[PDB]
C-alpha cells in the first residue's frame, strides 16, 4: 500500500515561469537515503533520477541540464518537488513521477505551457 | 504477488509469424515501461523490444527493427509482441519485464532495469 499522490495532475503555466511539480509520499522521520530513489522522466526523457542521495547526471537528458532540481529540503517532508528553470514549450507533455521507498509507485502529471 | 506469464511460444519456419502475450496480475503496469528479453542456451540475456508508459513510444533492438512490434493493452494488463519475418537468430526464451526503481540508472535496454520478469516463452526458429 506504498502510495505516491500528486496534489495537481495537470499545470498550465506561462512561458518563461520556474515550475516546480510535486509527488507526494509519507515521511515522517529522516529519510533512509540508502533506499530512497526518485525518478522524473517527460516523454521517455530522464530529467532526474536519484540514488544513493544523489542525482545521477550521466544519465539526465541534455534537454534539463542545469535547468531541473528534485528541491532536497522538501524531500525532507515527503515532497519530491521537480523545479524547471525558465519554462519553454519544450517542458509541455505528460511527466512521470516514481518514488521508491519500501515499495513503488508511479504518477503521471500533463503539463501545458502557454505561447511565448 | 506479482505475477508476469508469457504465452504464444512455439516452433515456426522462417520467415513465419508468431504472437507473443504477457498476462500481468498484481498490480496495474499502466505507468511502467514494459519490455520483451530474450535468451538462448549460454548466452547473454539480451533486450528486444520496450514500450512506454505514455503508451507512444517503442524501441527496439537493431535486428529485430522493422521484423518485431510490441504493444501494450493497459484495460487487460497485458503486453504483446507481434513477431515477423522470423530468422534463426530468434531462437531463445523470451521474456516479458516490468520496470524497475534502477530503470532510471540503468536505461531502457538493460536487464539491471526492470524488477518483474516472466517465466519465459520457448520461441524457436526451424533453423
Known amino acids: 500500500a506504498f502510495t505516491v499522490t500528486v496534489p495537481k495532475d495537470l499545470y498550465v503555466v506561462e512561458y518563461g515561469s520556474n515550475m516546480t511539480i510535486e509527488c507526494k509520499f509519507p515521511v515522517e522521520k529522516e529519510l533512509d537515503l540508502a533506499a530512497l530513489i526518485v525518478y522524473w522522466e517527460m516523454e521517455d526523457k530522464n530529467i532526474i533520477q536519484f540514488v544513493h542521495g544523489e542525482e545521477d547526471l550521466k544519465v539526465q537528458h541534455s534537454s534539463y541540464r542545469q535547468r531541473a532540481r528534485l528541491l532536497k529540503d522538501q524531500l525532507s517532508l515527503g515532497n519530491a518537488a521537480l523545479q524547471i528553470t525558465d519554462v519553454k514549450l519544450q517542458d509541455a507533455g505528460v511527466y512521470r513521477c516514481m518514488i521508491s521507498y519500501g515499495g513503488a509507485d508511479y504518477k503521471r502529471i500533463t503539463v501545458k505551457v502557454n505561447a511565448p | 504477488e506479482v505475477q508476469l506469464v508469457e504465452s504464444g511460444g512455439g516452433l515456426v519456419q522462417a520467415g513465419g509469424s508468431l504472437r507473443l502475450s504477457c498476462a500481468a496480475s498484481?498490480?496495474?503496469?499502466?505507468?511502467?515501461?514494459m519490455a520483451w528479453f530474450r535468451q538462448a542456451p549460454g548466452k547473454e540475456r539480451e533486450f528486444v523490444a520496450g514500450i512506454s508508459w505514455t503508451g507512444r513510444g517503442t524501441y527496439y533492438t537493431d535486428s529485430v527493427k522493422g521484423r518485431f512490434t510490441i504493444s501494450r493493452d493497459n484495460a487487460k494488463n497485458t503486453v504483446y509482441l507481434q513477431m515477423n519475418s522470423l530468422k534463426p537468430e530468434d531462437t531463445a526464451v523470451y521474456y516479458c519485464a516490468a520496470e524497475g526503481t534502477l530503470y532510471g540508472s540503468g536505461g531502457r535496454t538493460h536487464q539491471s532495469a526492470y524488477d518483474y520478469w516472466g517465466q519465459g516463452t520457448q520461441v524457436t526458429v526451424s533453423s
Open positions: 498484481g498490480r496495474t503496469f499502466s505507468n511502467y515501461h
